[PDB]
Design a protein around this ligand. Structure first.
Ligand SMILES: Nc1ncnc2c1ncn2[C@@H]1O[C@H](COP(=O)(O)OP(=O)(O)O)[C@@H](O)[C@H]1O
Lengths: 343, 143
């Protein structure tokens, strides 16, 4: 009887459901009066629609999704904003829970970047107590592959804020106006989702003359500088715009409220190689002792990514073998092949 | 790449694809591969960690690779025992593997035109000349 009791109550709920009818999902676009709205269906015409009495007038702001009755055409209840991986921008990318200890040997540079970006986003009370508008933007310059992007992801992970990564060389398109249009869409996108780390890649394409194609780079540069510092909303989002050649950069692009603080990130420091190998090879199972100084001396002019490839390729050598990392000769040949074959 | 136009249907397909590559974590037996002749027009969102990754690099075959490739696609054909595939590779430059098979096909076709069973080296040379639509004319000013 009891199991019949449960399934019969469920069946009666189903019977009540059969009488229930659906509502067209709609979106409010205007509020004429305190009983008048302009609601547009997802795929349908626009109707002048009223609201149910058991519903707050204020909550139905322009852009509030609603589910009106499909016969009387009256709003019955609000709905929160629709969610879907339909976003066309990089915000949905997660920088990954990587700490500042993961990037090794940039302690000074890490600290300057924290002071520039983390402070205005976490504790603005210091900046408002002093009386200065909080700084926005840090410029990381150095050899390619040194880990500026990893640094940006580490900041975006510690701050737990949305992160946008963009290849600046990709944004300059042959067709006119799309190069500045991409920056415009990027910034208006950052306006809605706040706070934002706007990490831009090598700017030398955008930042730094008698032809239309050359004046296009000028126009997109002006659009960029207008987006960072200027009219509309001065906003709170931050930029981790990084370049490869700092002399090419426009002097106006280096200003306090306009991407100051040229942080130099040179090739992994002499002591930094040891730390990088510790963080990127420690996860790899290896019971054998390490002669790290020998690897560091055998890896001169290496960049941060090279060490990760050394670790992965040493793992690969182990894969082509017993399975356990036991010998330094593997690190030697890994370094050599990450030296000659990565050239 | 991304760009209300009528491309907002394949866009949903690509985004659904992106959702499924990021939905499943590694160490499972769902290894994916993808092929394309133009990554210049590919959305880099597809080429991000958790998505495809590990971009394998396919170059135009070098001389020895071209000779080897031209050797494979002639095993089913009665090629003469004396055909210098290495010299064929020297005379075939800037040639993809598809053309390195088309040269063998055209050599066989020209041999059929000549009414011969086995393919001589000259048939392969004429295939090389004909795979790129060139016509060989005996110019008088060389001698
Ligand atoms: N200083 C570093 N410490 C630890 N890992 C690094 C460092 N530099 C680079 N890497 C590794 O290289 C990979 C890619 O580096 P990336 O951030 O693209 O360098 P860049 O920003 O200079 O192009 C990262 O996944 C990271 O693991």
């Amino acid at each position: 009887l009891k199991e019949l009791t449960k399934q019969y109550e469920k069946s009666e709920n189903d019977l009540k459901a059969l009488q229930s009818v659906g509502q067209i999902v709609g979106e409010v676009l205007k509020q004429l009066t305190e009983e008048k709205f302009i609601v547009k269906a997802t795929n349908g015409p626009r109707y002048v629609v009223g609201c149910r009495r058991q519903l707050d007038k204020s909550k139905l702001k322009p852009g509030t999704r609603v589910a009106l009755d499909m016969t009387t055409l009256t709003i019955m209840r609000y709905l929160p904003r629709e969610v879907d991986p339909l976003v066309y921008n990089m915000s949905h990318e997660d920088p990954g829970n990587v700490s500042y200890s993961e990037i090794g040997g940039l302690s000074e540079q890490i600290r300057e970047l924290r002071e520039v970006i983390e402070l205005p986003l976490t504790n603005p009370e210091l900046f408002q107590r002093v009386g200065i508008i909080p700084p926005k933007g840090c410029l990381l310059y150095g050899p390619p592959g040194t880990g500026k992007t990893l640094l940006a992801r580490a900041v975006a992970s510690q701050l737990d804020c949305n992160f946008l990564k963009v290849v600046s060389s990709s944004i300059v398109d042959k067709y006119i106006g799309e190069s500045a249009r991409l920056i415009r869409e990027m910034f208006n996108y950052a306006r809605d989702h706040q706070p934002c780390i706007i990490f831009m890649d090598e700017i030398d394409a955008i930042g730094g003359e008698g032809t239309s194609a050359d004046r296009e780079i000028q126009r997109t540069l002006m659009e960029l500088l207008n987006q960072m510092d200027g009219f509309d909303t001065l906003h709170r989002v931050k930029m981790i715009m990084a370049t490869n050649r700092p002399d090419t950069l426009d002097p106006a692009l280096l200003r306090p409220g306009r991407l100051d603080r040229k942080i130099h990130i040179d090739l992994p420091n002499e002591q930094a190689r040891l730390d990088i190998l510790k963080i990127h090879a420690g996860p790899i199972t290896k019971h054998g002792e390490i002669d790290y100084e020998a690897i560091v001396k055998l890896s001169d002019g290496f960049n941060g990514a090279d060490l990760r490839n050394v670790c992965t390729e040493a793992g690969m050598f182990a894969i082509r073998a017993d399975h356990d990392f036991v010998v330094q000769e593997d690190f030697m040949k890994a370094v050599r092949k990450v030296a000659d074959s990565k050239k | 790449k991304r760009f209300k136009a009528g491309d907002r249907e394949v866009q949903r397909t690509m985004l659904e694809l992106l959702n499924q590559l990021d939905g499943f974590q590694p160490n499972t037996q769902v290894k994916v591969i993808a092929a394309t002749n133009r990554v210049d027009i590919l959305d880099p969102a597809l080429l991000r960690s958790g998505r495809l990754d590990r971009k394998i690099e396919f170059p135009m075959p070098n001389e020895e690779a071209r000779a080897r490739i031209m050797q494979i696609h002639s095993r089913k054909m009665n090629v003469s025992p004396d055909v210098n595939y290495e010299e064929l590779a020297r005379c075939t430059d800037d040639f993809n593997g598809a053309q390195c098979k088309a040269v063998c096909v055209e050599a066989g076709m020209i041999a059929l035109r000549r009414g011969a069973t086995e393919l001589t080296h000259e048939d392969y040379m004429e295939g090389i000349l004909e795979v790129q639509a060139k016509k060989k004319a005996n110019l008088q000013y060389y001698a």
